[PDB]
Amino acid sequence: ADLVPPPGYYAAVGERKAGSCPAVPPPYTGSLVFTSKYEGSDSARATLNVKAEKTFRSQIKDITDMERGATKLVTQYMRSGRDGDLACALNWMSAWARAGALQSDDFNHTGKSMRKWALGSLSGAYMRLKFSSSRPLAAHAEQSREIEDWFARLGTQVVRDWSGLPLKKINNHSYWAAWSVMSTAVVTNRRDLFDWAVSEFKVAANQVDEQGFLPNELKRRQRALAYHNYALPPLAMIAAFAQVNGVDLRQENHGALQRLAERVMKGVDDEETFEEKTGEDQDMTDLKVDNKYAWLEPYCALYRCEPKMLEAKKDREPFNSFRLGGEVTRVFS
Numbered sequence: 001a002d003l004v005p006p007p008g009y010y011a012a013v014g015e016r017k018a019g020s021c022p023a024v025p026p027p028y029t030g031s032l033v034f035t036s037k038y039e040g041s042d043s044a045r046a047t048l049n050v051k052a053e054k055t056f057r058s059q060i061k062d063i064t065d066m067e068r069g070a071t072k073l074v075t076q077y078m079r080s081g082r083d084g085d086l087a088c089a090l091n092w093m094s095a096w097a098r099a100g101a102l103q104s105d106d107f108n109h110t111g112k113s114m115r116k117w118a119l120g121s122l123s124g125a126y127m128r129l130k131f132s133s134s135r136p137l138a139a140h141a142e143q144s145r146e147i148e149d150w151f152a153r154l155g156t157q158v159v160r161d162w163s164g165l166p167l168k169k170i171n172n173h174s175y176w177a178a179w180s181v182m183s184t185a186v187v188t189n190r191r192d193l194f195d196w197a198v199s200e201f202k203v204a205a206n207q208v209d210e211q212g213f214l215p216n217e218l219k220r221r222q223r224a225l226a227y228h229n230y231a232l233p234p235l236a237m238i239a240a241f242a243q244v245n246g247v248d249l250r251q252e253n254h255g256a257l258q259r260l261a262e263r264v265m266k267g268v269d270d271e272e273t274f275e276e277k278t279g280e281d282q283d284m285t286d287l288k289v290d291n292k293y294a295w296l297e298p299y300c301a302l303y304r305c306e307p308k309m310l311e312a313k314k315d316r317e318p319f320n321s322f323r324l325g326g327e328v329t330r331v332f333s
């Protein structure tokens, strides 16, 4: 059977009551060898290097602008239905597609991370255009084909980028990569990509220990809780997408996805168990950011959320997360 997204992705284009179309960021065709924002850290890779981060953000500026700008345009279109926003979004994505952006075989860890992040953002947003009951892509077949072929090329490459690794090298980056590949799989109806994403979820589920911790995220010391929370959105999205395609992953490794989510939310309330496990007081900075809990939307579509969990979701809605394609609450409501 053809691959499908969760039913919320079939929502009609809205008509809520007008921005213009900015120039497309220059397609990034360069090598993907970038500076790490943690350059100079020890094995925990948790010491921010402000100078390196500045260099990193500068190196990836056109990619960042593309990610944020294109998802914003799709969000605007799905909200208000102005054809100009659709036209602009498709112009941006098809320009990058035709150029073959982000396809470099020259990359380091940071660079391949950028490839999968951008793929997830753009395909995640495009998903709404593709499956909307309004069929907005009907009048844009040539551009649609160009964009989808590009996603397929990138998706195949992302599988290459994160395959062949042992568990100690499989962390939140692989989970995010698997989301990008799942998203691409459904846009492109590619079962092989779907299957890879499912396999990666299963690896993650089996990495969740008996208490709900992930060893490789615990290694990030004072950022441990933050990185556990960072693992949740791609894993929950993969499971929600897999479920409607006939693959139920909710019980993998004794309901590992639930065990991880509950451990995280326990730690958000009381930092104790994470400090005890890491031996360092946790940086709570990221845990204060509402949109970093966007995983609650697919999570509560999968599981019967207890009142604490439901309350956590309601108090932070609506969720916007460009790495998940934009309006997460809308596509699960």
Ligand SMILES: O=C(O)[C@H]1O[C@@H](O)[C@@H](O)[C@@H](O)[C@@H]1O
Residues within 6 Å of the ligand: 036, 037, 038, 039, 045, 109, 110, 113
């Ligand atoms: O420092 C690393 O290992 C990675 O850390 C992650 O948080 C990301 O910042 C990624 O871009 C880096 O390459």
